[model samples]
Target chain A: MLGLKTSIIGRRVIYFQEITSTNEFAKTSYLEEGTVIVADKQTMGESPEGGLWLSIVLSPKVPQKDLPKIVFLGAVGVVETLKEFSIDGRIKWPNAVLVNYKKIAGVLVEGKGDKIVLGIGLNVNNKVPNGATSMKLELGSEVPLLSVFRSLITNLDRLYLNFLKNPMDILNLVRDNMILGVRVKILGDGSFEGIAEDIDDFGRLIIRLDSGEVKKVIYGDVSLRFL
Target chain B: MLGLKTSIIGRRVIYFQEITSTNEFAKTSYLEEGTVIVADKQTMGHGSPEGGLWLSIVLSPKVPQKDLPKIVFLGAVGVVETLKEFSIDGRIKWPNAVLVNYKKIAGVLVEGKGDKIVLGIGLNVNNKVPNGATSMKLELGSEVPLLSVFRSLITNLDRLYLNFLKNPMDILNLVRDNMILGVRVKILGDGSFEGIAEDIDDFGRLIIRLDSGEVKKVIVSLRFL
Candidate 1:
């Protein structure tokens, strides 16, 4: 019933037998507030900057630079959605949710015109590829995905409304629970050892490495491995 | 016979056989109008960009701080016309000095404090300059009189400065025509977006046509690349 408590989202859910991507369809159409696009299966299966292969249409009145925060909010929603099924996970910084340090879900945010698309892929009651796990795999039982998706919309709609009122709350929620305070080494064009220190105001990682050198790291084009 | 003739420049002279830098001394000392600091040779002189004129002008103009960038153009214009006297055609590279045939022959550096500014000019009069640079002698094929060139620069610059005090707008065309128009430009203030140089604006900002098909006025370093 708590999941049904959401008003804005899941109000107009669009179902597709199979499509290239929910994210792709949403981008190509005009959408009302809280319209959720879900597919039974994706033929092309478009993936992004990480997915429930669900694309939620939203029009948040924020500056273009602040739009990245919506991606962070989606991460929080996926983590909270998993909580509804009694499954626990930690947000793997920026745009991923990890269960027992294994990636269980990811978020992709895209903006065009006045609307933004929050594309999320949560692994629930489904078999996944390498280095990934689903809720059903973790639970040894399948919870209906529609139930899982309801919680996603409910939690996300609530967070989106909260964002409209005040964004600092959203920021603090993601920052406090992110990969901050984790032992991590980022490997990419010049890899190094460091403690994943904190997320800055813009959701960038501030890493303090061994050798007394500290550097702020941005996501995209860089991958992180947590110890 | 050589030195300065204009009423506004070289009215007083300060000479040092060897010092750190004329720029350093001018920035530190209280200088009067038309005062010139000449060094025979400097120890830690900043290539301040050098056989060149390494001197600073302590000037207080009756204009707002927004007009400061135009002074760089004024120094460049002075260097160009000074070269004109030597019958060597010189071109100004935006926010830079006088260039002759793609080689840098002169440049200007400025640091301001309130109403006054310390403007440093470096002109290559003799070769001993680093590669990709030209000196007056190198371009002319014979050693020219250094003091005469100095006087020519001071007088030409002074005339231009007096005109600028009255109407700074007039200098934009000279600065524009003297520098190549329509250069592929990326201003320092913006996000390094590519653009074409359009023209100079009233306030010393460059008129630019951004690669995004947007026309915007900017003020920053100009790039050939």
Candidate 2:
């Protein structure tokens, strides 16, 4: 019955059948803000390898530089919770999650102050790696992990409780399932490649190189390729 | 002979009447770009006393490696503008010690390798600093000339490291206007709260306010209430 019919996220559920990490005990517990941290067996998930290694904990009231827009609102609540199974998911800017083009899900967003943990790692129905992809291996069979955890905690508590009146609609729902004008490459610390432009506001990642520059990339880990 | 009229930052000097650090021999020798390491005496202890101004420079900045923390906020605004060119008031006490009434005199580290960085500074001048430290001949009463305070702290850190390679938020607003802002503290690790000392964003962290009015963003290691 943990399939939450949410409001401020899972309303406080901690379930752990075998935890080694749910964002490392939801970042050293004392967790607040709609806390949630499920796991069946992680043994140190968060890739070193994984599959649905949850972790929610928030407290948002904003301002810590808008806590970096909660990682594009947790990648627009995992692309509207993978479009509730029709699985047209996509978004590889800021906090990953793709479909068909592989990678199933990922969003890390950690905390430092007024709470905010986030963490989700969906690849539903386990095992991935080989250019990852899974929602029952792209909608093939097995797919009920409590209805993808009550549709990703009801599309992330309805896009984070109305995400403060159109916080630019989570940066235009991560710029419409993100796939900006492709042809890119941008490895970290230094290295670039062009044409993946648009994502600015403050989340940065706008690129448009090959001489006629446009750059933005607010370095965290950087490595945005698709070419 | 090294009373620098700085150009890049002590061009190339290595003096060491006694050493154990100048950032450990300017980070394992072979240093080039602006190399510097002066010591007089340090003894691997890493404290602020004994006529401190134990140096270390050496860079090759092309920036990256996370902008080497804007050179420790450009060595705490080159030790508070080399203690405001000896009019001494010093402040900056977060992420880069350097106090003057609240005690401590100076400290700033910064490290990196392979394509070096180093940085280091110590600064207590005409030592005697011990009980919670304070110097510059105990806030100017006498002793001062330590090579004109290391030539105004390496020309105020080579003109603020060329304005931090063209404005690193103007060295984070001159280390947030030589920090030590507001007051009232105690915010240690693993649960130890109380706040006040605010503002230092843009990822230079620390922007507390939590006495439960909630608004914490610490980059802790502070004191003074």
Candidate 3:
């Protein structure tokens, strides 16, 4: 019983008792965009937080350049849902939901032809990493998944619509929550050190290097160290 | 006896006795780029000269948007060169459609989705072309081995594609030389207009001079009068 209250994002939910990967399922299904796929038991799994594993098929009419922003919105939706449960969650830009500086959820965005699969894994009920906490752990009780699903799907719908109307709002929310003005190591293809500056309109992270040169980091691993 | 040359293009050929559409097959197969898929019998076929040899080529060369037209032009050049191997001269209509004796012999349809391109080419080989159509057997007055023609097409396509990667202008000149320029044609779209086919400009648009002395460049679709 997924208490989904979304017009499009989670309107059509396909729940599976077990699945290899919801993202893989969504890619091959050729379903319409905004269809949500949920797996109760993700047998072929890898995650610290054993929780909700779901993927959404996204076929946006927007430009391909704006595709990254949708993933950012998804991250924001997750963080906002965590906020409702009184659990302080922060965003690790590109797309990672963190609580207490540890990853509680991860976002995997994959492209296939004209469509994209946006998969989100969140820690809700079971064992997580050493530094991470799940919604059940934070709340100190076994929370019904239907309530959590309602909140998540509702937030996702709101944020996705906001993304269509004003993506800047979600961008700003992500920017404010992300670690800024701090030293970070961005790795992919090559590694570089820079001070986190800002995220551009296209959802690209702008980093100012040590030599006073600014560069926009597109896709890479961003590691931030706490002083 | 497939005489496939060049580094790629048709090095790996997938042949089907009958198919709905080669383009549709290649798009869904998720095969390696530069792989060629050919079909002998296309049941659900649609082209200028219907019921012909149809094939689809998968190309993943990250070409710029400006150079996309060259791929379409490469199709026409490949088919025309293949016809020449049988000593049959074939002309190219604007965009990429092979013509013979003012009749349609072949047509090229290029579809691009993201970075991958599927070029569908239908050549009139060893088939009877209806009304305004002409096949190789019809033009040459004899039946050529389908394998020989297929091999020639594969080789010529590989060469033209490689040439396209180097200097697109070279392929442009080849298309221009075979195009039936300075001919009266009808531009087909929202409304039709009769004009003299002047020249093919850069970016592969057909420049036509109307009776009102106004020049219009046709890009999407057009037909010869």
Candidate 4:
């Protein structure tokens, strides 16, 4: 019998001896609420040099569908949570976890039809690869992967619960976490240097590039460097 | 230098392997005007099942970054082409390759954000599993794995090219070969369904039940009785 455990954020737990990637497995499974899948290792763990790995965390509760408003609500929470770890981290475009001049995490979520899979890879656990660092590395020697998982679940559950109760709170966090007053480059398919302005309600990165053009970026990889 | 020679469709001059899910790898890399990637094996071959294997096939010119408005478009095309030899097959929700009733093939592609990856499972190529049949079980009697790989890649490239070239000829063939329609049932979660439907353009199954409810098209084994 499957029973819900308030203490346990995920519902079901599955383990694999060795497969491709746990993140992929979790995403395809449309993982039940609070489902935690652990893999021995990820064969395809390394992504584009500056990319991160993410896993599916939550399932919808009401409307039982992909409501568009929920996108910004959830994304802002992820950006805000990671911000607590690094002062330099800021939201880039639709959803990417960035740290100053480096990209330590990438948030991937697919929704619209019926199911939405939410995933993020924080430079969590393991000796950081690709010049990436986890919360553990930043604090020095080592951080327990299990502890990191626990905290992530806690933080994620809190965010989802709070959002369900009241969405504005999560939105407020996004507004507050904006790397306001910072001069940065707004680069996408084309190179456009701009000031990292503010995050719109829907999570678009606001940029004021030279020539006074204020542009909002919805998607693309971005890098902030000292020019 | 990766090149496949043919007079009919076209040629794949370059292909790369990254030891990951073809879909995942393809979704992150930059595709030169017409570059493609193929792998001997994928560590994580995505399938309809939650924890199954999927292979990634990359098609340049048809870079997923450009967005081709279909669910797992490349995988579906590849599976249709590869399985064409056996039966006039069709695809179902999430990732399922269907032939008649036994449910022959399934395909899924995960290419949205960055790169493009097309992962496919041929089910019982080296040897036949109890669940389904293989080329050997069908008509080829017994076949070697590497040869199977070559043939699969050729078919995959052909279908992929057609999809990229905006050729609708293959779409009708794909639907004719599909086996997902004509089943009476309801879609889960979303509460929708179409009985005896024709074509693989409804995204996932979107099965509608008696109560007029729609459900997400996941690969779930249903009982007709």
Best by TM-score: 3
For residue B145, give model 3's deviation from the true position in Å: 0.6
lDDT measured at residue A98 in model 3 versus the true structure, 0 to 100:
77
* Pairs that clash in candidate 1: A51-A121, A51-A122, A52-A120, A52-A121, A52-A122, B52-B123
DockQ of 3: 0.01
> Residues A77-173, candidate 3, lDDT per residue (tens digit)?
7888888888888877778887777877788888876888888888888687688778788788866665566678788888777776665677788
Off by over 4 Å in 1: A1-5, A46-51, B1-225
Candidate 4 docking band: incorrect
Cα error, residue B73 of model 4, in Å, equals: 51
**Candidate 2, position A196, lDDT:** 82
- Candidate 2 lDDT over residue span B11-61, tens digit each: 545544455777876777675667666765668846333566777888877
Instruction: Give per-residue CA lDDT, model 4, range A1-227, as digits (tens).
Output: 01123332444334332336656766676445555544434467543221223454455655532243354443554555555554356654445545654555555665545555566666654555565555555555544444444445556667767766665565567666545667766555786777777766555667887789998865436554434
TM-score, model 2 to reference = 0.22
Model 2 residue B192 lDDT?
Answer: 82
Instruction: Kindly indicate the candidate among 2 and 3 with the higher lDDT.
Output: 3
Clash pairs, model 3 backbone: none
